């Protein structure tokens, strides 16, 4: 039920708090700290899945900016303008959304 089930704690804590500036988040440099390049693709789905709030098989605009605090509860939330360009990157098909394969894409990509 906790990312601390799926990836290391300091692992955790050195990827977030390399994004506590503001704008400054980047996802590829996050998701190598954080170490889901390391991981399985079904602990990626895992992770996908713990990002989705409401259980739609999607990671919407409003669910986005709250990936921080799927890894850290402490954390902050993201910027519209850090969440906008985050869709942005990850939206493949323009639904405005983001879903597990999409998700998939963006951890392999980094
Ligand atoms: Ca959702
Ligand atoms: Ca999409």
Same mark, same amino acid.
């Given at each position: 039920?906790? /990312?601390?089930?799926?990836?290391? @704690?300091?692992?955790?804590?050195? %990827?977030?708090?390399? =994004?506590? @500036?503001? !704008?400054? =988040?980047?996802?590829?440099?996050?998701?190598?700290?954080?170490?889901?390049?390391?991981?399985? %693709? !079904? !602990?990626?789905?895992?992770?996908?899945? /713990?990002?989705?709030?409401?259980?739609?098989?999607? &990671?919407?605009?409003?669910?986005?900016? =709250? &990936?921080?605090?799927?890894?850290?509860?402490?954390?902050?939330?993201?910027? @519209?303008?850090?969440?906008? /360009?985050? /869709? %942005? @990157?990850?939206?493949?098909?323009?639904?405005?959304? &983001?879903?597990?394969?999409? =998700?998939?894409?963006?951890? %392999?990509?980094?």
């Amino acid at each position: 039920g906790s /990312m601390t089930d799926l990836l290391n @704690a300091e692992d955790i804590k050195k %990827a977030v708090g390399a =994004f506590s @500036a503001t !704008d400054s =988040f980047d996802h590829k440099k996050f998701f190598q700290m954080v170490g889901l390049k390391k991981k399985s %693709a !079904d !602990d990626v789905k895992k992770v996908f899945h /713990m990002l989705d709030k409401d259980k739609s098989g999607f &990671i919407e605009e409003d669910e986005l900016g =709250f &990936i921080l605090k799927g890894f850290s509860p402490d954390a902050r939330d993201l910027s @519209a303008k850090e969440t906008k /360009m985050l /869709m %942005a @990157a990850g939206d493949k098909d323009g639904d405005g959304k &983001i879903g597990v394969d999409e =998700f998939s894409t963006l951890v %392999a990509e980094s």
